[PDB]
Amino acid sequence: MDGEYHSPYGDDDLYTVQPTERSPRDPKAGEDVILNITTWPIENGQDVWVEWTKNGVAQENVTAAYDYNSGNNTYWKADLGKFEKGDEITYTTKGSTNGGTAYESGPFTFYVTDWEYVQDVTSVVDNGDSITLNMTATAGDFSPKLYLSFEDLDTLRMELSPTGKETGHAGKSGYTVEDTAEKVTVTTEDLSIEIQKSPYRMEVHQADGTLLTSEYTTANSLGWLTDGKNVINQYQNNFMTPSDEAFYGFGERYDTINQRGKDVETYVYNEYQDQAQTERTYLAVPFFVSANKYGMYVNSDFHSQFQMASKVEDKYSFVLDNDGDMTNMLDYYVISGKDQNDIVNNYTDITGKTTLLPKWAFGLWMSANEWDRESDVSSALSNAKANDIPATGFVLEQWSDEETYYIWNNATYTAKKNGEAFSYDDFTFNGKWTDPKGMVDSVHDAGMNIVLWQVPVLKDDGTVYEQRDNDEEYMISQGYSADDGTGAPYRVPASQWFGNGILLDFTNKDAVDWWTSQREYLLTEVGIDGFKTDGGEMVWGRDTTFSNGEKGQEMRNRYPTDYVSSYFDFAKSINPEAVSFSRSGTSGAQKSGIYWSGDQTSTFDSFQASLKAGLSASTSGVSYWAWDMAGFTGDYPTAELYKRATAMAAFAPIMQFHSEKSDPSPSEERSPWNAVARTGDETILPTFQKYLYTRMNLLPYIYTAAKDTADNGKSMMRQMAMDYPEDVNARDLDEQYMFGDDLLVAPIVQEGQTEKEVYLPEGEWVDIWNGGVHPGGETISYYADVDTLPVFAKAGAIIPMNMTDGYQLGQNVGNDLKSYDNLTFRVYPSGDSEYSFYDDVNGGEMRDISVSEDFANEKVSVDLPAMADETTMQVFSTEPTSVTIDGADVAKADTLDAFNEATTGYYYDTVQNLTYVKAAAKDAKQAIVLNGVNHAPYEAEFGHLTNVTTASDHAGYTGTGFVAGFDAEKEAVEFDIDAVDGASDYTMEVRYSAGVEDATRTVYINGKKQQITLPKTANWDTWNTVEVPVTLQAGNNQVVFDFEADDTAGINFDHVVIKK
């Protein structure tokens, strides 16, 4: 016998076990305890046994029996039997061959547990800023205490002390209590908390009485798992949930946006590519938002399992782990708010606000693992320029020596001792990187910023490399690693990524200062702009111990955020414009930069999953989210996937392309120029350009939304139910979302699809590309070829943009971040709307713009505040008869060139139905009024057409053309028309041409028929308007124009306008 081995918890992995563990790891009462033991080599005459005590009394030895052999080893099972709650078992496993050398493992101790639950509230003590509920338990001899406090008047905090020896924290005092013999009610202006005393049971209501959530119907819902003497290993609570409740968030989730029916694990993990299928994630957060208008946050870094109607149909539960410490209270919050986004804001009050990033973060980020030398970088920059791709972000991954990870590849130097930091001058730069500072300089010269890839582990694959060995030596001697629980440094389990490597203990300030000081020259001298801090999901083992005294169970989820946050703050301390780009974290991750969805494939299935990950991450407070556009590996994406992915990426929080392969032939770059090369489809380039340029045109709206995230907790990209939680059609949507406050984006995420369903909530929605109007409250069908993305503006939207003199979306404005070309505000008038623009170009002043729609009196008014730049309003309406600024008429410009050369004026874009109004910069409010205007036209060519087509051969039409002829039976044009101001009579203007003879058409208004006369126009190049009286009602009015048997003559139908 060369050895024996048993270790009850193995690596403490949630998904797998080592072959020498105890099962169950933590025995409960009535569970059979099995010890898996190994001996080597495989040899006859081996004896394996267990020496042990139960409650301090020696037991008869238990003999192990063989299980199987594998490799050089024999595996055995020793059966200890079942135990009762309270039993303390201590054991040593032993092996020997023929009475000789006994080898052993242990001693190991476990305490047998069982569940104890809250029974009744015996007394209530109101301390003014906290309330204590003294309770009885269903079993055992504890005297538990549940403390209630208010983090705010709409945010309830519960802290449970099973033994009653701990005390909860103070909160707000603005509550009242109505305590009676059978019940206690705690009320604030936002919540009503009703608590039955016997048995204890809590219901959380809004002040108006509406139920938010409640503990399970049978009570005894709240519990702890204990042996009654030494340990508390888990906590649980159970709640009632009706069949229709939807549950969002839980960190970044790849399988579904609605976790109803799932057992959700709060456990960070590095799962390569099949995150959806395994239901795993790098970024896990114990916070969810329910469409029933509340969120719940379990405040603990230990692993938890959320059982969302996965066991019993009307029950959800959380089971939270603990390390045994009986003084650790259960601490969770039930979070209300003014709306769903305010619930997220309240959550970030507790766990941390998003840190506003510099504007460069919101441009295109270019990346490819294959970029591994200076010539690759100069080529990327030249290709970007040759293809008119003004990106703002650049990433290097394969930049280092691949040993120390803070030294440029090929650099030579005099190896240092004692972890002393190098300076740029210490190195002689060779081969792939002859001048790193110059390389960096060239990136900045192109208007981009660079980040370098990092890991939180000191590599140790057993190979010899002088400087790495020097650092490992120093790190261990300073106690800069975490401890394995025996005085030795913690190493990542062997079979994992960076197996055998030593983690830097990021809880240890001195260790962090040392680790970062090795990277300092990169920021102070080389001039980088941040780090792509990869990995973090590397803490295994229960006995793993950190300088803060916490161990592995508690630190696994926290470690990656301690790591990311440590680098983020460090980089920023030296360079205020620095940005981190990471993948792993837990609650609080949002404070430290960008999170991307990790490693996926270039397929539509993966694209769908990526969108689910961004939507769930959003609800969980991680707003600055990215993904590898079109996937980073697998067979190269098809032109169709690359085009569909580019569209979505451009209308996402962070836009970034990337690829896995280190030295492929041909190139695996997910760049647009390489995509053209690989697919042979040259049309990819102008489509990518269109989207990238549109994003840059929208950068003012995007960056303002980025600031709203930081200040008010509203994520940039949001699942539909975050804005419409009561809308039954919005609950499960995962192929569209809101972007900023006012844009609805509906990416085509299915292969071969061109008929896109888009669910439109209540109100009016306008296609931002062409001015097509879509009343809300139904699912429409939008024809989207491979180059097209449905995007719609909400009623009342005010959207800042940076336009060229062309003034259309999709025109290249460049990547200048320090000035605007033509600062423009796109407006869709609807009642009174306001917007606060973040003018970062001019010191970050908030510009409060308001708009007052008054179509009933043919007017739209804009109150423009003082600005530092010339402004152009683009207002969706019919053509004005006049426009005033401060009561003085501004000049009408007949052409766009004339509009551009003017200092002030107005111009009507006939194709887009937009009135441009130009105002000069002034240190004073300016009152703009558009007179004689009506709601924009409903274009006939955008209507639902039956057996009739469009044309554009006779000039003077609005929109893109008109419906041509429309002169045969069963030919029809149907509009979806909104009442401008509620149910009422209105005048409908019908614009047409009838160059040959008088005509008539039949019109149906919500089923009510009338015939209209359309007299002859001078010729087909002459348009006329006819006014028809209609009665419209609230919502969507179906207005169908038909050519019936008694109708006559051909016309060209331009549009209809609704007015008073």
Ligand SMILES: OC[C@H]1O[C@@H]2OC[C@H]3O[C@H](O[C@@H]4[C@@H](O)[C@@H](OC[C@H]5O[C@H](O[C@H]([C@H]2O)[C@@H]1O)[C@H](O)[C@@H](O)[C@@H]5O)O[C@H](CO)[C@H]4O)[C@H](O)[C@@H](O)[C@@H]3O
């Ligand atoms: O050759 C010139 C002529 O060609 C097309 O039609 C010939 C069409 O003429 C007479 O009928 C038309 C009918 O089709 C419809 O026309 C509307 C259409 O008019 C112009 O285009 C016609 C073509 O249809 C063109 O002049 C115009 O440019 C276009 O924009 C309009 O949509 O309705 C008119 C009025 O009732 C009718 O006169 C003729 O009766 C028929 O035999 C012949 O096929």
Ligand SMILES: OC[C@H]1O[C@H](OC[C@H]2O[C@H](O)[C@H](O)[C@@H](O)[C@@H]2O)[C@H](O)[C@@H](O)[C@@H]1O
């Ligand atoms: O939102 C309106 C409309 O947008 C697209 O169609 C625009 C398209 O409509 C007609 O075919 C005109 O003749 C063209 O000039 C326009 O480009 C969507 O495909 C459609 O579904 C949507 O309703």
Ligand SMILES: [Ca+2]
């Ligand atoms: Ca038209």
Ligand SMILES: [Cl-]
């Ligand atoms: Cl007209």
Ligand SMILES: [Cl-]
């Ligand atoms: Cl009517």
Ligand SMILES: [Mg+2]
């Ligand atoms: Mg699906």
Ligand SMILES: [Mg+2]
């Ligand atoms: Mg609040």
Ligand SMILES: [Mg+2]
């Ligand atoms: Mg290369």
Ligand SMILES: [Mg+2]
């Ligand atoms: Mg700098």
Ligand SMILES: [Mg+2]
């Ligand atoms: Mg009004």
